[PDB]
Design a protein around this nucleic acid. Structure first.
Ligand SMILES: [Mg+2]
Ligand SMILES: [Mg+2]
Ligand SMILES: [Mg+2]
Ligand SMILES: [Mg+2]
Ligand SMILES: [Mg+2]
Ligand SMILES: [Mg+2]
Ligand SMILES: [Mg+2]
Ligand SMILES: [Mg+2]
Ligand SMILES: [Mg+2]
Ligand SMILES: [Mg+2]
Ligand SMILES: [Mg+2]
Ligand SMILES: [Mg+2]
Ligand SMILES: [Mg+2]
Ligand SMILES: [Mg+2]
Ligand SMILES: [Mg+2]
Ligand SMILES: [Mg+2]
Ligand SMILES: [Mg+2]
Ligand SMILES: [Mg+2]
Ligand SMILES: [Mg+2]
Ligand SMILES: [Mg+2]
Ligand SMILES: [Mg+2]
Ligand SMILES: [Mg+2]
Ligand SMILES: [Mg+2]
Lengths: 122, 141, 106, 55, 246, 42, 87, 361, 110
RNA sequence: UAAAUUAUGGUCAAUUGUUAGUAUUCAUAUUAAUUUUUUUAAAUGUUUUAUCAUUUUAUAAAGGUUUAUUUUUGAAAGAUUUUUUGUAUAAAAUUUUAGGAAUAGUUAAUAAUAAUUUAUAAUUUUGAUUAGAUUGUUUUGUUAAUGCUAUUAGAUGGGUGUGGAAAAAUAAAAAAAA
RNA sequence: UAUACAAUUAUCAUAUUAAAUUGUUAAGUGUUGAUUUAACCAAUAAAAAUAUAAAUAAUUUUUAUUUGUUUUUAAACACCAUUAGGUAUAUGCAAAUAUAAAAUUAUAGUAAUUAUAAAUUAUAUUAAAAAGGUAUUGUUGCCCACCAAUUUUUAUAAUAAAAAUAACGUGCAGUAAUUAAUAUAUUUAUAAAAAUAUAUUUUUUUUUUUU
């Protein structure tokens, strides 16, 4: 019981997911971040976790930062069991940003954390 | 103010307002006004744990008038059901029915307030009457 | 509420078997029992959950687990653009309708 | 609390339970709960010109 | 360290703060206590970053220096007066001609009023505490200088003459303040919290242990009872009167 | 004892202790929440 | 209960050990005397551990292996294990 | 020479300073950890344009004349003559609206006074704080939806943009006041909020604000980790603007939805209605696709014109199918993730893979 | 700060004890801290943390073969280039160059 | 924002340590266990057949796996005179170590392609991969109780690939074509 | 061996809604010499004063930013050393009590606990009256480190670390305790510890409502 089952009647658990598109570096492939729910009966409370999926968009509509509906399907490639069923919210700003030749979204400033100290000046 | 701290609820500090105002023997308390809060007040005033109450249709708050008898209060203890808003306790009808029973004798002495699917604020006695389960709010006696 | 009700080995403490039929069709498991790899360790998952708790069919009105506010319903209301709060007028999380729901007959 | 789990003291058990506590979980605001301090002051001397493709 | 006690020392004293720490706090800056009955955003008075209190100069009239000032209190005693309703007598013309100024109508009453507290407003911490020293904000106490009234003195009369303001009292027409006041004063709040005994909220009531108050509320039509309201009153009257404890 | 466990000032109302237990693991097992994916008892 | 004193029982109630040395040690004041301490050996997962335990037992004709049980505390600091019988 | 070295004599509280010594003056970070040495030429232009003076746009005079032609008619009769009645009051709805002279004194009120007074209330005589408030009022007026609008996103974003520039150049001058470092960082955060709400309210204004004041550096997602989990895009969910688009003006909705009964995706119903939604492509995707489109023509040409080479390759493939690990497809062979479903083989039996996970799952 | 303010738990008194530490306890732990610090000084400890290296793992320079105090114990194995650079750092830390900021000096620093 | 009755209904929550100034779930208690006792297991030769062959007879050896294990009817059941269909291999959740860093026959598109196809690739600080320990999602014990504390065992790669399905090299207690 | 924290107030190290930052002033020569100090020794001595308002409240800064170490003595005081000097106070680096925690010690296997506050303790110039105890029939009371043997665990730094411990030899660190103690900082060293820079009372108090 969470948002996803609240909106959908799913034939099988995880057959529908709503998420955001994070990155498209792969042709006809949209990566999607999605939330699901965990219950701790000891404390009687819920937590939201998050998970990434590869979804198959033929025809390449999805721009990074789209709100998409996603469904379970035929095995497509090694990691893609999901396809983009519908764009709920497209990214209008991102699309106009692309049309001008710029990247959909600015690339994140820092990468993953390190245990070193990088001294890089000028 | 931070993460580890409990997440307070209008019910939580409603109960603690009343408790502290009862300890200082005050006649009036100004207290948070939400649906289930003034629900709780009407129920307490039904059972006579409280002298009176009013909502002035002021947005934030409304007021409760406390009752004292024989020099101490009419309220022994008043406690909220949950410390957080992130925790929600559900009361099965059989549980609310257990409360009513003290080793074979019917006990209405203590009152428990709860929400219904129907948005009603009820004591556990009417709840058991119509056999509906509800979400816990507070106990008082 | 006691230890005897902890033991589900009684049939009186356990959701009955037939539920799994009602969800997946009748005599559906006889298929699964003849499967190649079975019961070592795992068997084709047996779904028995009291039918008023089913996540698939039921919703916020008949099922108490849906109307839990701070994780399911909070997100839903943020998304749909209803005003919401901890202790609200409507059973689920919400003080009022959103703009779309007020302006459109569904 | 069984004494074999985690440290030899008791409080070590509750110190690893705080790792699983529901309202303590890692998110976009609270990050790197388990080693905060290895990553501290890591980029101080790393000079990165921010990304602007728009005037 | 040495794992044992080298000294055999048993103090017999049991200070109440050491034992029950749930109810008492000996830490400095935590002394203001747990008060729920304040108006601030924390029930813990000592985390509140707004009004820092002054233990030396405060609490003449309020008792302890921890407790809220007379004008900010959200809880009221039985025999103590509650807040004055601000005005900002003409409207008592219907009343007793001799009746003077009602005790609860005040010209100047500010629920938001900054009381001067030294540790906030005069802060000597960064200094050696010599006679002139410490940093002071003057925005708290109203200026007793003559500079103000001199600098602003004009031939155009004041705001009241010019009637610049819109609105008025925020509640619109108020029997005490704007409009005239008719009928009787309820000085205790007895009629102000009562429970409607009726589905129409026409008749309301207040019950003590052994006494019962039935009050007819129809201020619009001048307390003229309808057929339904009267047939209702004959119910509330005899159900109040045939009650066991009245 | 700055170094040691927090103690309640008074007891806890047992009735409330039983009211907060409604959604606990035993009640869930009785409702049938967890999927039975293995042989279980023989 | 003190659970770290039992380290060499390894989750067992009793142990089997072989005799090596027997020396004497003086207890913590104000208890004077000589406490007899037997220095024993046993093996687990092909590791040979030297166990050090309090000799309360009765020695008859010369014998080798003992049976070790853990107790409460004793006069002598540092010696957790006690002797049941000698075989 | 090569990495910095911290030397710590452990009896001392802290290490000795490093050998290369670092820069003598600490770099000034923005909120996200990016470094600005100085204002960018654009921001610099904004402050140089604040400093010497601001101006009321004749836009306001114009809409004043079209909306209240009578009042403007009166002022048009009376120019240069001292006025005892302020006809111009509609032109300046708010106290803040008149910035061209000190103390919110409208221009046409100075008609009958001394020229010395006129110079004493001029822009040149403003304090610096007053000048900031001037620039802020001008810009707030150009982006405001009505006169008294403050809290709306565009206004908020602009005023915070300005405040931010001011604090930035201030820190450029006098290096250590960390009070204002902190206030700059907080302002930058609230600016980030305001802008990200703007692009989902009206995006062109969002664009032209970024282009006027040159803040794109606080719209950059902070770090890859929290971005990959889609918590950067998760913001406009919390703000409640996620569904706010009102498509129909853009993006004809007919091909954005999937078929519930059919099961076909949105790309499918778009295919069927003969519509194409496709994001503009970079050169990557274009040259990949244009390389792939032609496979069959290249192949047809190959097997027509050069049969022997083909037959060689085919020999190798056909014979390969009989050699190799698995000859037939079973649950074991047809496991899409081999190392994942059998992890228990990975060290000992199966040496091909050194790790159990190469993908999301 | 890098080093430890305290050693062991210096504030142990009963709850609501209205000071961080009692005199007795703080004196005990002052003793232990004293012993440790004195050990650091006389053995001539030196630690280093180098850029572009794991930081939590600190090269102990006081054990390096050149700077080692003992004539007996085998010191440590650190890269030849890096160790040369560490030796140069320790050496040129010693004395005050004018125009540089004055930094505390001691016998045990050499 | 009013009370309620045609009256005990819808079937039992109930806590037992003789301590040693005080603060803090910590020795000596009961229940459950190991200490502790031969009233439930068991021996080798599976069996037909058309003869050097061909039919019947499919998950207890070990290794140590935490994003992990998933599947058909073509065998038998099984009934007509012969051609008989379609549905399956895919996923989602839950995943341990006090003091925490990078992993890799590697992602996605093309296709029954490429030991050198094309690409701005994939996993990771929302805790990865190695490495320790460990047989995973109806089984226990204590308890008035949200808890704490158990649950075995059984799926370990390929290399003339038989068979419906690899589950195929002692170790039954499954009647195996009169 | 298993067998139920708190959530109304809990002092050592995981900060967070905040208004600051910047100011060029002062002071110096007449003359024949015992100043300062409990006491020594070097040897011109005078001095560095001004700012309020304003900044809006909350929702994704936790790899970012931040908590008294600072160029210039040809300028002193002060401090450290001793007639021969050093140093003389926020441009590098530096997270860190203001508390989110589960019996003491201990680098998270060592010993079995520890910590704690009001009982009791004869001399402080009132027309005799205010006072502290790590001891517990109580100063002939207790305790503190180094300096040997041994015992035991390990994350082996001049001479490893830690814990048990009842010798020998130095002293006299602590109980307002013979220059009050306590914490941080820096230096110093037979050993407790000592010098200086800041905070502070688990140290004992001495008290001008315009003169
Ligand atoms: Mg149980
Ligand atoms: Mg003691
Ligand atoms: Mg005493
Ligand atoms: Mg053990
Ligand atoms: Mg003993
Ligand atoms: Mg897979
Ligand atoms: Mg392996
Ligand atoms: Mg020191
Ligand atoms: Mg096997
Ligand atoms: Mg492993
Ligand atoms: Mg899974
Ligand atoms: Mg799978
Ligand atoms: Mg083989
Ligand atoms: Mg902390
Ligand atoms: Mg200097
Ligand atoms: Mg040893
Ligand atoms: Mg040693
Ligand atoms: Mg002494
Ligand atoms: Mg001393
Ligand atoms: Mg002394
Ligand atoms: Mg000291
Ligand atoms: Mg010394
Ligand atoms: Mg010292």
């Amino acid at each position: 019981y969470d948002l996803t089952s609240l909106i959908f009647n799913q034939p099988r658990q995880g057959s529908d997911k709503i998420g955001y598109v994070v990155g498209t570096s792969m042709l006809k492939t949209a990566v999607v971040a999605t939330n699901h729910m965990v219950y701790y009966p000891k404390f009687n409370q819920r937590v939201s976790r998050t998970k990434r999926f590869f979804a198959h968009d033929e025809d390449l509509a999805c721009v990074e930062g789209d709100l998409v509906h996603i469904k379970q399907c035929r095995k497509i490639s090694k990691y893609k069991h999901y396809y983009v069923f519908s764009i709920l919210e497209p990214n209008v700003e991102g699309r106009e940003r692309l049309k001008l030749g710029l990247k959909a979204v600015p690339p994140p400033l820092f990468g993953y954390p390190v245990s070193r100290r990088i001294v890089k000046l000028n | 103010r931070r993460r580890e701290e409990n997440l307070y609820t209008p019910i939580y500090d409603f109960c603690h307002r009343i408790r502290e105002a009862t300890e200082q023997r005050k006649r009036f308390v100004v207290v948070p006004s939400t649906i289930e809060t003034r629900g709780c007040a009407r129920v307490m005033h039904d059972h006579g744990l409280v002298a009176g109450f009013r909502d002035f249709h002021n947005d934030r708050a409304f007021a409760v008038e406390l009752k004292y008898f024989q020099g101490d209060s009419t309220i022994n203890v008043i406690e909220p059901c949950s410390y957080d808003g992130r925790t929600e306790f559900e009361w099965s009808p059989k549980m609310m029915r257990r409360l009513l029973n003290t080793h074979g004798i019917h006990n209405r002495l203590v009152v428990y307030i709860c929400r219904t699917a129907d948005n009603r604020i009820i004591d556990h006695i009417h709840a058991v009457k119509e056999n509906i389960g509800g979400r816990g709010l507070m106990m008082v006696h | 509420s006691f230890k005897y009700a902890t033991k589900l080995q009684h049939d009186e403490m356990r959701q009955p078997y037939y539920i799994h039929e009602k969800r997946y069709g009748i005599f559906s498991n006889e298929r699964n029992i003849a499967k190649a790899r079975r019961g070592l360790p795992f068997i084709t998952p047996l779904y028995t959950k009291h039918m008023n708790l089913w996540d698939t069919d039921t919703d916020a009105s008949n099922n108490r687990f849906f109307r839990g506010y701070y994780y399911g319903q909070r997100e839903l209301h943020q998304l749909l653009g209803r005003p919401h709060s901890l202790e609200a007028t409507n059973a689920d999380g919400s003080n009022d309708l959103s703009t779309y729901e007020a302006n459109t007959s569904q | 609390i069984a004494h074999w789990y985690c440290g030899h003291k008791f409080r070590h058990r509750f110190m690893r339970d705080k790792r699983f506590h529901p309202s303590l979980q890692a998110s976009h605001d609270a990050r790197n709960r388990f080693s905060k301090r290895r990553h501290f002051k890591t980029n101080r001397w790393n000079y990165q010109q921010a990304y602007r493709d728009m005037p | 360290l040495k794992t044992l006690d080298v000294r055999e020392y048993r103090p017999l004293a049991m200070p109440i703060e050491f034992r029950f720490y749930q109810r008492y706090a000996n830490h400095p800056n935590r002394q203001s206590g747990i008060q729920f009955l304040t108006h601030y955003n924390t029930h813990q008075r000592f985390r509140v970053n707004k009004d820092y209190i002054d233990y030396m100069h405060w609490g003449k009239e309020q008792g302890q220096a921890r407790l809220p000032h007379r004008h900010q209190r959200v809880a009221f005693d039985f025999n103590d007066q509650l807040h004055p309703t601000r005005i900002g007598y003409a409207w008592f013309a219907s009343q007793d001609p001799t009746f003077g100024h009602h005790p609860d109508l005040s010209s100047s009453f500010d629920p938001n009023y900054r009381v001067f507290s030294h540790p906030e407003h005069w802060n000597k911490m960064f200094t050696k505490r010599r006679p002139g020293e410490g940093d002071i904000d003057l925005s708290v106490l109203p200026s007793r200088s003559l500079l103000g009234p001199l600098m602003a003195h004009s031939d155009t009369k004041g705001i009241p003459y010019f009637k610049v303001d819109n609105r008025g009292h925020s509640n619109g027409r108020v029997p005490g303040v704007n409009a005239p006041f008719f009928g009787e004063f309820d000085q205790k709040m007895m009629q102000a919290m009562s429970r409607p005994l009726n589905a129409n909220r026409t008749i309301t009531g207040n019950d003590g242990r052994f006494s019962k108050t039935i009050m007819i509320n129809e201020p619009q039509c001048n307390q003229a009872l309808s057929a339904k309201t009267a047939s209702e009153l004959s119910k509330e009257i005899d159900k109040a009167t045939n009650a066991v404890y009245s | 004892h700055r170094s040691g466990k927090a103690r309640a000032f008074v007891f806890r109302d047992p009735s409330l202790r039983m009211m907060r237990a409604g959604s606990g693991y035993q009640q869930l097992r009785r409702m049938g929440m967890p999927m039975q994916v293995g042989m279980g008892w023989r | 209960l003190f659970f770290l004193r039992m380290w060499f029982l390894y989750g067992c109630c009793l142990r089997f050990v072989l005799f090596v040395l027997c020396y004497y040690m003086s207890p913590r004041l104000p208890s004077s005397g000589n406490r007899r301490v037997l220095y024993a050996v046993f093996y687990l997962y092909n590791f040979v551990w030297m166990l050090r335990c309090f000799f309360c037992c009765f020695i008859g004709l010369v014998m080798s292996l003992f049976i070790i049980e853990g107790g409460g505390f004793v006069d002598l600091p540092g010696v957790k294990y006690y002797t049941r019988i000698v075989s | 020479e090569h990495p910095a070295i911290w030397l710590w004599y452990p009896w001392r509280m802290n290490p000795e300073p490093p050998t290369p010594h670092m820069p003598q003056r600490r770099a000034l970070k923005n909120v996200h950890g990016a470094v600005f040495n100085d204002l960018t030429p654009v921001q610099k232009k904004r402050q140089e344009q604040m400093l010497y003076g601001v101006n009321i746009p004749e836009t306001r005079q114009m809409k004043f004349e079209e909306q209240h032609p009578l009042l403007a008619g009166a002022l048009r009769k009376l120019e240069g003559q001292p006025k005892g009645f302020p006809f111009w009051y509609r032109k300046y709805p708010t106290r803040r609206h008149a910035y061209e002279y000190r103390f919110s004194i409208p221009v046409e009120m100075l008609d009958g006074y001394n020229d010395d007074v006129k110079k004493a209330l001029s822009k040149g005589m403003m304090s610096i704080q007053e000048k900031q408030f001037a620039q802020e009022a001008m810009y707030m007026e150009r982006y405001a939806e009505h006169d008294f609008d403050t809290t709306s996103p565009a206004v908020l974003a602009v005023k915070r943009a300005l405040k931010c520039r001011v604090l930035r150049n201030h820190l450029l001058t006098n290096p250590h006041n960390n009070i204002i470092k902190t206030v700059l960082a907080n302002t930058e955060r609230k600016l980030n909020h305001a802008l990200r709400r703007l692009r989902k309210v009206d995006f062109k204004k969002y664009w032209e604000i970024i282009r006027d004041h040159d803040v794109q550096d606080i719209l950059q997602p902070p770090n890859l980790v929290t971005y990959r989990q889609g918590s950067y895009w998760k913001y406009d969910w919390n703000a409640g603007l996620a569904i706010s688009t009102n498509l129909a003006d853009v993006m004809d909705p007919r091909g954005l939805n999937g078929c519930v009964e059919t099961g076909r995706s949105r790309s499918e119903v778009a295919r069927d209605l003969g519509l194409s939604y496709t994001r503009p492509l970079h050169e990557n995707e274009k040259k990949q696709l244009s390389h792939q489109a032609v496979y069959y023509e290249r192949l047809a040409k190959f097997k027509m014109e050069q049969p022997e080479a083909a037959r060689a390759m085919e020999r190798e493939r056909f014979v390969r199918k009989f050699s190799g690990m698995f000859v037939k497809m079973d649950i074991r062979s047809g496991a899409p993730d081999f190392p994942s479903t059998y992890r228990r083989l990975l060290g000992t039996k199966v040496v091909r893979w050194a790790s159990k996970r190469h993908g999301p799952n | 700060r890098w080093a430890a303010k305290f050693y062991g738990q210096v504030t142990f008194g009963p709850r609501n004890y209205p000071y961080p530490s009692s005199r007795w306890l703080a004196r005990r732990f002052q003793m232990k801290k004293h012993r440790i610090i004195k050990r650091f000084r006389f053995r001539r400890y030196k630690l280093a943390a180098v850029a572009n290296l794991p930081f939590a793992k600190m090269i102990r320079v006081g054990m390096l073969p050149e700077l080692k105090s003992s004539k007996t114990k085998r010191g440590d194995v650190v890269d030849p280039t890096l160790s040369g650079q560490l030796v140069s750092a320790v050496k040129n830390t010693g004395e005050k160059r004018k125009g540089q900021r004055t930094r505390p000096k001691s016998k045990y620093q050499v």
